[PDB]
Design a protein around this motif. Sequence first.
Motif, PDB file in Angstrom:
ATOM      1  N   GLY A 150      -9.824   1.357  -3.222  1.00  0.00           N
ATOM      2  CA  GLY A 150      -8.803   2.117  -3.933  1.00  0.00           C
ATOM      3  C   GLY A 150      -8.248   3.236  -3.063  1.00  0.00           C
ATOM      4  N   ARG A 151      -8.795   3.638  -1.870  1.00  0.00           N
ATOM      5  CA  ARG A 151      -8.440   4.778  -1.246  1.00  0.00           C
ATOM      6  C   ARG A 151      -8.162   4.385   0.184  1.00  0.00           C
ATOM      7  NH1 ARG A 151     -11.862   7.713  -0.336  1.00  0.00           N
ATOM      8  NH2 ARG A 151     -13.770   6.656  -1.040  1.00  0.00           N
ATOM      9  N   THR A 152      -7.871   3.227   0.637  1.00  0.00           N
ATOM     10  CA  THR A 152      -7.730   2.868   1.972  1.00  0.00           C
ATOM     11  C   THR A 152      -6.358   2.042   2.041  1.00  0.00           C
ATOM     12  OG1 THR A 152     -10.251   2.275   2.127  1.00  0.00           O
ATOM     13  CG2 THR A 152      -8.696   1.408   3.929  1.00  0.00           C
ATOM     14  N   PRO A 153      -5.771   2.595   3.104  1.00  0.00           N
ATOM     15  CA  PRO A 153      -4.298   1.971   3.472  1.00  0.00           C
ATOM     16  C   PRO A 153      -4.429   0.704   4.068  1.00  0.00           C
ATOM     17  CG  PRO A 153      -4.359   4.383   4.556  1.00  0.00           C
ATOM     18  CD  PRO A 153      -5.825   3.763   4.219  1.00  0.00           C
ATOM     19  N   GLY A 154      -3.409  -0.311   3.402  1.00  0.00           N
ATOM     20  CA  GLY A 154      -3.241  -1.631   3.894  1.00  0.00           C
ATOM     21  C   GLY A 154      -4.485  -2.546   3.564  1.00  0.00           C
TER      22      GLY A 154
END
Length: 129
Positions: free
Chosen positions: A67-71
């Motif tokens: 839920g907090r990682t780009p891409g």
Amino acid sequence: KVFGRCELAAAMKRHGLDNYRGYSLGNWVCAAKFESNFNTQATNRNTDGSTDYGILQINSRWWCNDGRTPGSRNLCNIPCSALLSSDITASVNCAKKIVSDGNGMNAWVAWRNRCKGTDVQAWIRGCRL
Ligand SMILES: O[C@@H]1[C@@H](O)[C@@H](O)OC[C@H]1O
């Protein structure tokens, strides 16, 4: 949980990792050893926003969703927290998918660095299988 060498080998073998896509069981035990030191709760939070989760340090950009990682691609379709369980099932199933999605065991840097080209059989030698 911090697995023992032979205990983890047996558990990985029960989940069919021995010779999965041509990689002997010792390869997988060796990968876990140097990725996480057999620690199911291991985490590595990276500067790129992603985090490596669990006994096989599976990364949150492609493989699981925290839920907090780009891409985020979440190709294993699981919350990353599931990879921090005392039961290795989710990590094994996602590791298989990582290979099924075109990667070799090169996808684990610790395996390349510390296992590729070595006597990986040593990591299961002496174990009840
Ligand atoms: O989906 C399953 C996969 O995760 C693994 O366990 O290999 C067999 C499949 O049925």
